[PDB]
Design a protein around this ligand. Structure first.
Ligand SMILES: Nc1nc(=O)c2c([nH]1)N=C[C@H](CNc1ccc(C(=O)N[C@@H](CCC(=O)O)C(=O)O)cc1)N2CO
Lengths: 290, 315
């Protein structure tokens, strides 16, 4: 239910606890929240504000093939992670307007070995989902494994993917906000619950819901099953103080019907062309600082 | 409140579809659930049925001290992990009693077999208790809760004390959103007697109060959940004692919440009972660290529950 997201934003406004970090960022937060999305009722892209689907699907697609290189994202006009990769280039060896960014994006896109040394991001979801390093130097492919398990043992209560490794977290720049997820099958239907330890409630959460609903759909298709529910579980849910006006504005609009997801008749061969949304009619974009 | 748990059991009875589980017992099940317990309103040891706290603290201390051998538990008359150890032993090459295949179910249907099990179990326990060679090989459940909390193994030859780190993070960085301890180590799962049912937990701080949330992938609602609730409530209190905070909420999030098909009458009888006030938890003021607490240091007072409701463990 979209109203379940709107109730959470309202509850953060009504009773969220104010905190000022060391650096002067202010949030209102709560701890312990759950919202359900029945995927048969519609694909849960928010109608109260426009949410760009392109970037969600290229990002998910990138996670799914285990890719940790940005070339794939650049090729599809996704600039999410291309800051970190650029930063890494300007404090490196081989190096008022900054049109040097342009030459960097271009070289990554048009060079053989250049994209390997400057486009690699190492340890994030794609690598944690598809390639979890063991002590003996072997690797566990958790996603593929959970897929096989769905096919051959639907009743399993162990359909689990973890993104959280206590060895790697204190040294990585962005520890995974999406901590783990669990699949579940009953009566020909696939559901997924996701534990998110930390959530940007205005800007992050709407991205997150569509991403994991899409994931559920893709695994459903792969396993020949129908879609059940997406259960989104939160830990630290926070609304940045400069997102309040934008939230209040969102609550003043009326909910429309969720649109329809359409998938081309294995999801590891899917590109952008194979995933469409039908009947998306949201209220205009609501801008906000990051 | 207890009503939160009571309501969960009712909803499974009413709406939970049937599922073929790993143990072969059969379950009714829902996916996606959350319960809140305000620890300031009392210590959530269930009143609608007697719950053995002595066993809750045993199992907790055993987790905290990093131990995954059942030996420690038997010295303290706690037998709730016996079956997984015993199973491993009766599958081994060193077992020479009568056949024990699917002993979990055959004890419920066959009184002749129920006495053979009983005696093979009595001799397993004696052997674990008095024979240290046997104990070492057959008391062992693998890298479960204790080993992941205190001794999660690194690639470069060391270990992360996951629980200790997070406690000290509460003291200096109370607003952190990374106050996480995970028991799910993909490398160790297939050598675990069971992969962790209460998989992963998180902590939060506001206004001098400490709250905890648990994600429990798989939840035995009649027999296990009341243990798990009390287990994490107690843990939250220990950490609050050490770090000098009050207690906030315990939030129980569940994946597969299930009622075992042979737990239904139990849950029914339970639901027909009037809730009584929760007891109050009492900790020894002199102790400073979580890891310094022993059995006589942790007590519960004014616990006045309805009677014990017996049920069979799914093995
Ligand atoms: N099927 C299953 N469910 C679980 O909840 C579970 C499991 N297996 N295997 C391991 C851990 C062990 N937990 C257990 C918790 C309680 C009892 C139990 O039978 N309690 C009884 C007996 C008390 C007594 O001995 O006096 C009770 O009446 O409460 C058993 C195992 N665990 C849960 O994490």
């Amino acid at each position: 239910m979209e109203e379940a997201y709107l109730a959470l934003g309202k509850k953060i406004l009504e009773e969220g606890h104010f905190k000022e970090d060391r650096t002067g960022t202010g949030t209102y937060s709560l701890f312990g929240y759950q919202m359900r999305f029945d995927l048969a009722k519609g694909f849960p892209l928010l109608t109260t504000k426009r949410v760009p689907f392109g970037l969600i699907k290229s990002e998910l697609l990138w996670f799914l093939k285990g890719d940790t290189n940005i070339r794939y994202l650049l090729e599809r006009n996704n600039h999410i992670w291309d800051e970190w990769a650029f930063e890494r280039y300007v404090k490196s060896a081989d190096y008022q307007y900054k049109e040097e960014h342009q030459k960097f994006c271009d070289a990554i896109l048009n060079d053989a070995e250049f994209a390997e040394k400057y486009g690699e991001l190492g340890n994030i979801y794609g690598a944690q989902w598809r390639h979890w390093e063991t002590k003996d130097g072997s690797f566990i492919d958790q996603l593929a494994n959970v897929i096989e398990m769905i096919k051959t043992n639907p009743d399993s209560r162990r359909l689990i993917v973890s993104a959280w490794n206590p060895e790697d977290v204190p040294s990585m720049a962005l520890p995974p906000c999406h901590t783990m997820f669990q699949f579940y099958v009953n009566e020909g239907k696939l559901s997924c619950q996701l534990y998110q330890r930390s959530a940007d409630v205005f800007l992050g959460v709407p991205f997150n819901i569509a991403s994991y609903a899409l994931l559920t759909h893709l695994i459903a298709h792969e396993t020949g099953l129908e879609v059940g529910e997406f259960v989104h579980t939160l830990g630290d849910a926070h609304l940045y103080q400069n997102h309040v006006e934008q939230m209040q504005e969102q609550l003043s609009r009326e909910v429309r019907s969720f649109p329809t997801l359409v998938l081309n008749p294995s999801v590891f061969d899917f590109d952008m062309e194979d995933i469409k949304v039908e009947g998306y009619d949201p209220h205009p974009t609501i801008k906000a600082p990051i």
